[PDB]
Structure 1
Amino acid sequence: TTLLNPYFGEFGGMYVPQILMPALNQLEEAFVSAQKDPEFQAQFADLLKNYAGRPTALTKCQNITAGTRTTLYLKREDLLHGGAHKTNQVLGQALLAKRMGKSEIIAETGAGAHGVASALASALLGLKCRIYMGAKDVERQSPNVFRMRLMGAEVIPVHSGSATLKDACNEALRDWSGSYETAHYMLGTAAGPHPYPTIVREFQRMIGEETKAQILDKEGRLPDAVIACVGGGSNAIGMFADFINDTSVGLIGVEPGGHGIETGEHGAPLKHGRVGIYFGMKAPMMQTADGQIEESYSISAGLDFPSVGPQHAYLNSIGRADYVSITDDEALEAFKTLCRHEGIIPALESSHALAHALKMMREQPEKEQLLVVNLSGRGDKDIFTVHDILKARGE
């Protein structure tokens, strides 16, 4: 029994061991209560404004579209405190944890942005934070691990399975089952068991609400399309939510194509996987023929996840949103182009969204189109990675 619908059509649900169901039910109730509570909303608004820096800019990118009939705006989540959109919903979830009387936080991270966001929020709001991270991730994300530790977080390497984000995901659920009376699990994307896909959307929806206000002010209309990268689904659903009922507005999600879809080395389960049940949800998965969960791949660590949130699978199925893929090389070009022509260093995750908008423009340069790309994060974290590639190419 739940207060809200756990499904988006066939996708979603609560596929957890029985022991975890009270934890999910408690969280749902607290969320529903919080949503009707002006005092909660005011606290959340205060942190978003005065701590994180909202509203974020909407930047018109003139150089990159010169000589075409594309007008391109970037929603500047790269300017939020922490350097990515992840901060929005961690602040909301940390307040929910406090509302429920919890004193501890568990979080998973792959790339490290959500873990840093969880550690910063924990430091601010007086929660004791532990971060599970695949041992492979820990090894290759020394900078993010150090920030978490500076900010007072315990960082726990996970050696189980492939020692990566999924296993990190598992260990977090493993922990919470035992600890939920005292600890809140701060899931970092719009995926996992209900109520997380719904909570994460509602605590990211100011992205799209601001974008709409900003585009009406600047252009006097709605965008023709809004475009966002899809790792698990949070930044994209945050951009899409307020436009879902505006039927004229295209909703485009970009999955990582890795070395190419045909190589099988990618992270595009929504369009190239198969529905399965894992991480608490029924959703498109990359999986072997016999149902083992496959390892994804992307140049971008933040997109390297073999599943996707259920609301995206639903919006795809009914034709409301369209999903595409962008390869490592396309994303790298978009990265370089934005740096050189607009003076903004984008996260490699966000660079996938930008790359698809550039393709929309370049393929049809006399098509009139007003596009918004969600620039989910800044790419300071990526400069070493990009350096090593350009060098190995000899550029």
Structure 2
Amino acid sequence: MWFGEFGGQYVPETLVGPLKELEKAYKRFKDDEEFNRQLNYYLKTWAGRPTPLYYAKRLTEKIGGAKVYLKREDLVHGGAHKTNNAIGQALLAKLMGKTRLIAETGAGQHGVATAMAGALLGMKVDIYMGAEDVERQKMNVFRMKLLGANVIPVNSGSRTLKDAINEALRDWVATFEYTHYLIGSVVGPHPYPTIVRDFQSVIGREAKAQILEAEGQLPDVIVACVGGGSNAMGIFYPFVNDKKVKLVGVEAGGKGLESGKHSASLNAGQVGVSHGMLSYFLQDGQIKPSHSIAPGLDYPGVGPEHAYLKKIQRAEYVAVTDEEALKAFHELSRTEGIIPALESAHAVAYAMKLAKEMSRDEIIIVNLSGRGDKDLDIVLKAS
């Protein structure tokens, strides 16, 4: 329910029954063998898990510091980590008797992931997406339509992700009987922060096995970009009790932390309640609209488990600017032949700065959360 004080379930009474049913359905099927057989089966044969753990030898040597490894979620079917959570929840939804999946999306990766999982399982799919994000990630919109999903543009309010979430919750109150709300990050009311983190933990578990195989020891640091926090929690979670392993979350610094145009909730937000949770939100009392060049990081909030990890000081949280993200995007494309997602490039940008201060014997794993194909128009205009 809570992580320290953070998290909770601050929702209208209409949503208590649904969320309790989800929580019981989950608690039941969480370790049902037939459920975990089907999940592993689709993750392996349809999604392509396990993803590899790539030693970036040229990047490492150019920096001349720590050994930089990349956990390659860019290679997951769909092109990002989001698919891991989309399969899990859609399978749960199907076993709960639901015939419809709804979801919010910003970058379009979760919307596509939900459409793909929906198409796979023969469920109807309606995706709520802000109009600024529709035009900014147009490829993902046509993919959702081709996958059989319906994309619903939200022009209201700020006309972006925050407002996409508001529309989806409004839908789910009206349709929860047959509709499952497939939330795409470690956000929202309980049980969602826990469910999304659990379905993303596979990343960290693989990466742990893979780095012991490659290097014969645990990594010194793990770096992952933080929007709502799902790819970061996924890779973080199985190393939480390895005290020697530092954990670093990288938020969108946008035009700069002192500019008022970023998405660093943990770094510069205030504690507050929104979308059913207590966590950090950017705010003026009223919640601020955020900015990032990476549309997947463009969310005022952040997941409560990160808010908790920051407070107990288990994880460190930093930021990286738009300019620094774009530079990591080109650096990685040219030096390693991997075109990263702009969200992921934040992680890469900080890992390259951090690698320089660390020694040749030391080890950093970067969660490469997605591929950059969706961002080609953005990087092209930015040029």
TM, length-normalised to structure 2: 0.98
Q: Check if 1:221 corresponds to 2:217.
A: yes
Q: Which of 316, 328, 333 in structure 2 is aligned with 1:334?
A: 328
Distance of 1:82 and 1:327 partners within structure 2: 26
Counterpart residue number, 2:108: 112
Distance of 1:293 and 1:213 partners within structure 2: 41
Question: Deviations along 1:104-158, whole A, 9 cap, x unmatched?
Answer: 0110001101000000110010100000011222233322111111111111111
Counterpart residue number, 2:15: 20
Distance of 1:148 and 1:387 partners within structure 2: 23
Structure 2: 5+ residue stretches without partners: none
Q: Which of 274, 291, 297 in structure 2 is aligned with 1:297?
A: 291
Q: Check if 1:33 corresponds to 2:28.
A: yes
Distance of 1:42 and 1:233 partners within structure 2: 27
Counterpart residue number, 1:174: 170
Cα contact 2:204–2:237 (8 A) shared by 1: yes
Counterpart residue number, 1:373: 366
Counterpart residue number, 1:49: 44
Q: Check if 1:320 corresponds to 2:314.
A: yes
- Post-superposition offset of 1:40: 0.4
Q: Check if 1:11 corresponds to 2:6.
A: yes
User: SS at the partner of 1:322?
Assistant: strand
User: SS at the partner of 2:208?
Assistant: helix
Question: Superposition pairs for residues 158-169 of structure 1, below 5 Å?
Answer: 158-169=154-165
Distance of 1:203 and 1:212 partners within structure 2: 16
Cα contact 2:137–2:374 (8 A) shared by 1: no
Distance of 1:137 and 1:380 partners within structure 2: 15
Q: Which AA in structure 2 matches 1:165?
A: L
Q: CA, structure 1 residues 318+184, in 2 after alignment: closer, same or farther (shift >3 Å)?
A: same
Q: Which AA in structure 2 matches 1:350?
A: S
Question: Deviations along 1:218-243, whole A, 9 cap, x unmatched?
Answer: 11110001110001010000000100
Aligned residues: 382
- Post-superposition offset of 1:365: 5.4
- Post-superposition offset of 1:35: 1.3
More deviation, 66-75/34-43:
66-75
Counterpart residue number, 2:351: 357
Distance of 1:162 and 1:355 partners within structure 2: 29
Counterpart residue number, 2:200: 204
- Post-superposition offset of 1:382: 1.1
Distance of 1:327 and 1:109 partners within structure 2: 22
Q: Which of 68, 82, 99 in structure 1 is aligned with 2:95?
A: 99
Distance of 2:209 and 2:361 partners within structure 1: 21
Cα contact 2:74–2:340 (8 A) shared by 1: yes
Structure 1: 5+ residue stretches without partners: 1-5, 391-395
Distance of 1:380 and 1:131 partners within structure 2: 20
User: SS at the partner of 2:273?
Assistant: strand
- Post-superposition offset of 1:367: 6.3
Counterpart residue number, 2:242: 246
User: SS at the partner of 1:213?
Assistant: helix
Counterpart residue number, 2:127: 131
Q: Check if 1:386 corresponds to 2:382.
A: no
Q: Which AA in structure 2 matches 1:357?
A: A
User: SS at the partner of 2:8?
Assistant: strand
Question: Deviations along 1:41-82, whole A, 9 cap, x unmatched?
Answer: 000000000000000010000101116231111000000000
Distance of 2:373 and 2:138 partners within structure 1: 14
Distance of 1:134 and 1:387 partners within structure 2: 22
TM, length-normalised to structure 1: 0.95
RMSD value over aligned CA atoms?
Answer: 1.0
Q: Check if 1:62 corresponds to 2:57.
A: yes
Distance of 1:168 and 1:40 partners within structure 2: 30
Q: Which AA in structure 1 matches 2:160?
A: T
Distance of 1:263 and 1:134 partners within structure 2: 23
User: SS at the partner of 1:102?
Assistant: coil
Distance of 2:272 and 2:358 partners within structure 1: 40
More deviation, 251-260/32-41:
32-41
- Post-superposition offset of 1:159: 2.1
